[PDB]
Ligand binder design. Structure first.
Ligand SMILES: N[C@@H](Cc1ccc(O)cc1)C(=O)O
Ligand code: NA
Ligand code: NA
Ligand SMILES: [Zn+2]
Length: 866
């Protein structure tokens, strides 16, 4: 497999302006007729090179003349000797039922559906499968009326007909030119939830949510979230929907989360279906996030698209930013920020320290499906957020406005977007652009001094990004570094110098620089990198008392949680070292006291309390260490939980009871109280065994919603309580017919601390609710084991690696995209001890030797073994 490079981008030799597609649909053999109007822009002797994969070519015509001047090559149809303007007609066959990779046209249960991003359209017909080729689509679909009574594509229905032999047809037209990755087709039988949204300016939009027969009871929340997204984009960004119909189709078989195809989004059912007995608070908020996300792409991705796939973050960073802003505006901003920062520090930093490290705008890609990453998405969003921090909301919105004014109806670049922001705001972003080109996590080191003679506070701030596998050269970045200074009363000290106020967002642009502040009337306690103002690791020599002071006094709830994290980091590191020496947990009394104070604080937002009382995950803990000891981390997390459970037992039970709610509401105040109650339950489960077992069993049985039931079940598994096996069996017996609900149970099985967890996981490959044919099931059992049970995955006998090799040997052939998702824990080998590295290396070497190794896995394996 050959790498492609960003610097090799060149405008296409040919454009296509219009394409008329006909599908004669059948699961075994679908016939595609594609009539394209093409224009040559390149040299008169340049051939037209069409991408195509796994197509059976039937005929090629140019202006209705059977064409003799063509050849098929690997992945392509090369057509020579063309006029400047012409009509290309391709007829070819494909086989949806054979498509186990779920890219192009495939089968999802009884439905046929498409996934074209990034390069799936070339699995449907021979085309210019590149996002800088925008064309106006019409789509005619012909199918069996009984099997496929709904035939959907992008845009509006313009024609329909009936045929003999029980077939019918519908034709769709989408007026907006689009790259082919935004093409969608769906055929099947569905229940349909229909509603309406009227835009600010009065455009009535028909909303249609297509779900499998019998699932209408699970559709209203997704519909509500769609309307909420539409309203918010109007209010916040001044953007209205631009078509007459908005369709969403929920499908069970889908490699990612959801897809923004123009006017016809296709969603993994996990991000659509919810009822209070099947879905948790987290599920509701994720449906809200993902519905919003795909909707927000209508402008940031569709109306302005990507010139090439190296510009993926142009749409993903910005749309992730938009979905975060949506969730934050509607819900708790602090909880959203906290959770997004957990993801950055615990998962994205890991990627940036791995063989797969890349800038948010990659320079080199072998398989583009490998670059739908934490970096491109979540770090991409942090980069957009830094622009927002530097510009402020008003200037940022001016930049958005200029971006659309310049680029609406075209494919643009990351650089185009930065230039629009810079031009609209008059803020210089020339240095800032380096965030697009440089991979790895910067480390920002802060030293301070207080001078009582002059009442000056001095911050000496340095930065460096360590070399990464992809880049030997690193340079200083433009780091927006937000600070606050607190006096002894917990009041904010005004930032000033030489009689003039100083902006609290410091521009850290050099390898080292000093900032001096005047009229600092008391030695300050600083809050540093406020609201995680740049995606960096902070090195500052905090005292415990500075941190507990911030937990008490910091103005922003994020800073209070972040202070608690810094406090915990010290003792997590202490206790991992102790575990390695065979010693039990040690924790100063004043540390437990800080968490007691959070429990008993009557003024603190329960949403914030809940997050402070949620310990960093084993993944967040891992990124505190150069060399990861996953067993020590797991056992320290448990020991810390047990210690706090014992020290805080009375307080935990009081707060658990105080936050009882008889009514279940998907409302932010209620969610906050419930998150706090369940955080308390988690500790209580690790307290005295009998009380724990009673409390957990009672909550599981008395729960009137899945949030509370799952919290209890999860605690029973985590703490290995007597009731565990009974509760797990009850859940299976009740829910086995419901895959999405069973995913939660497979996750609990996979992440179990039980000694026999791998045995159980292997056995579950035969479970009635499991199938290797379904990405969600695969991710919930196998993925959760490898990625979310590192203690078991990294068992010293190497059994975890061997299991993953076995699974990837199947998935490499079946569904390379899912295989590539699942190989990730194995490519982190350099973070582990020598003995583990050698076993993981052996595992990777076995995979490298697979017959018919997918490009997806090849790219990751070669980087890992380098
Ligand atoms: N474009 C989708 C993501 C996606 C990408 C590729 C896929 O195959 C599926 C989904 C989004 O981020 O909104
Ligand atoms: Na990276
Ligand atoms: Na100091
Ligand atoms: Zn997206």
């Amino acid at each position: 497999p050959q790498a492609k490079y960003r610097h090799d981008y060149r405008a296409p030799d040919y454009q296509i302006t219009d394409i008329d597609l006909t599908f004669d649909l059948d699961a075994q053999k679908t016939v595609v007729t594609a009539v394209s109007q093409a224009v040559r822009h390149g040299a008169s002797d340049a051939p037209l090179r069409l991408n195509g994969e796994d197509l059976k070519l039937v005929s090629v015509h140019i202006n209705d003349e059977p064409w003799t001047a063509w050849k098929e090559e690997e992945g392509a149809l090369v057509i020579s000797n063309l006029p400047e303007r012409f009509t290309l007609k391709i007829i070819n066959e494909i086989s949806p039922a054979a498509n186990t990779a779920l890219e192009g046209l495939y089968q999802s249960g009884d439905a046929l559906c498409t996934q074209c991003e990034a390069e799936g359209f070339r699995h449907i017909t021979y085309y210019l499968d590149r996002p800088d080729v925008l064309a106006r689509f019409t789509t005619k679909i012909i199918a069996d009326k009984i099997k496929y009574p709904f035939l959907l594509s992008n845009g509006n229905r313009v024609a329909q007909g009936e045929l003999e032999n029980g077939r019918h047809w519908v034709q769709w037209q989408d007026p907006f030119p689009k790259p082919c990755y935004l093409f969608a087709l769906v055929a099947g039988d569905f229940d349909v939830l229909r509603d309406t949204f009227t835009t600010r300016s009065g455009r009535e939009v028909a909303l249609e949510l297509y779900v499998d027969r019998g699932n209408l009871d699970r559709a209203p929340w997704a519909m509500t979230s769609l309307k909420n997204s539409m309203k918010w984009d109007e209010e916040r960004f001044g953007l209205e929907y631009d078509l007459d119909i908005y369709m969403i189709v929920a499908v069970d078989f889908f490699n990612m989360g959801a897809m923004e195809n123009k006017g016809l989004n296709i969603f993994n059912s996990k991000y659509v279906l919810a009822r209070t007995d099947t879905a948790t608070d987290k599920d509701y908020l994720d449906i809200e996030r993902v519905i919003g996300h795909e909707y927000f792409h209508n402008w940031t991705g569709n109306r302005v698209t990507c010139r090439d796939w190296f510009q993926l973050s142009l749409k993903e960073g910005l749309t992730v930013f938009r979905d975060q802003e949506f969730s934050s505006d509607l819900g708790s901003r602090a909880v959203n920020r906290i959770n997004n920062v957990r993801t950055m520090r615990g998962l994205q930093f890991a990627e940036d320290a791995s063989p797969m490290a890349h800038p948010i705008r990659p320079d080199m890609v072998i398989e583009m499906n490998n670059f739908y990453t934490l970096t491109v998405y979540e770090k991409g969003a942090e980069v957009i957020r830094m622009i927002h921090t530097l510009l402020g909301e008003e200037n940022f919105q001016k930049g958005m406005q200029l971006y659309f004014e310049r680029h609406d109806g075209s494919a643009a670049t990351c650089d185009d977007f930065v230039q629009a922001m810079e031009d609209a705001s008059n803020v210089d972003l020339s240095h800032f652009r380096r965030w697009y080109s440089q991979s790895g996590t910067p480390i920002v080191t802060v030293k301070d001094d207080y001078n009582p003679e002059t009442e000056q506070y001095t911050l000496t701030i340095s930065q460096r990004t360590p070399a990464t596998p992809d880049q030997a050269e690193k340079q200083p970045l433009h780091i927006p570094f937000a600070i606050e200074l607190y006096d002894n009363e917990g009041k904010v000290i005004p930032l000033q110098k030489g009689g003039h106020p100083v902006n609290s967002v410091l521009n850290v642009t050099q390898a080292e620089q000093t900032f001096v502040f005047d009229n600092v009337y008391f030695q300050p306690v600083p809050a540093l990198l406020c609201e995680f103002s740049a995606p960096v690791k902070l090195e500052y020599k905090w005292s415990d008392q500075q941190l507990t002071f911030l937990m008490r006094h910091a103005r922003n709830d994020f800073s209070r949680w972040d202070a608690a994290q810094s406090l915990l980091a010290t003792y997590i590191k202490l206790n991992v070292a102790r575990h390695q020496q065979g010693q039990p947990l040690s924790l100063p009394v004043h540390v437990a006291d800080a968490f007691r104070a959070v429990l008993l604080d009557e003024k603190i937002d329960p949403a914030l309390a809940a997050e402070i009382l949620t310990l960093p995950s084993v993944n967040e803990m891992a990124e505190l260490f150069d060399i990861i000891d996953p067993i020590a981390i797991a056992e320290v997390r448990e020991a810390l939980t047990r210690t706090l459970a014992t020290e805080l037992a009375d307080e935990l039970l009081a707060i658990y009871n105080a936050n009882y709610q008889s009514e279940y509401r998907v409302e932010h105040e209620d969610i906050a109280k419930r998150t706090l109650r369940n955080a308390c339950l988690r500790f209580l489960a690790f307290g005295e065994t009998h009380l724990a077992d009673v409390l957990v069993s009672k909550q599981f049985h008395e729960a009137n919603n899945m949030t509370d039931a799952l919290a209890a079940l999860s605690a029973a598994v985590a703490a290995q309580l007597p009731c565990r096996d009974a509760l797990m069996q009850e859940y299976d017996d009740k829910w086995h017919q419901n895959g999405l609900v069973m995913d939660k149970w497979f996750i609990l099985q996979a992440t179990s601390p039980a000694a026999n967890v791998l045995e159980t996981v292997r056995g579950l490959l035969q479970h009635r609710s499991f199938t290797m044919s379904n990405p969600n099931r695969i991710r919930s059992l196998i993925g959760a084991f490898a990625g979310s049970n590192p203690a078991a995955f990294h068992a010293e006998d190497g059994s975890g690696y061997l299991f993953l090799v076995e699974m990837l040997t199947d998935l490499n052939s079946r569904n390379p995209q899912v295989a590539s998702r699942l190989i990730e824990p194995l490519i982190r080998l350099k973070r582990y001890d020598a003995k583990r590295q050698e076993k993981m290396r052996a595992a990777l070497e076995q995979l490298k030797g697979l017959e018919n190794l997918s490009g997806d896995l090849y790219e990751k394996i070669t980087k890992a073994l380098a």
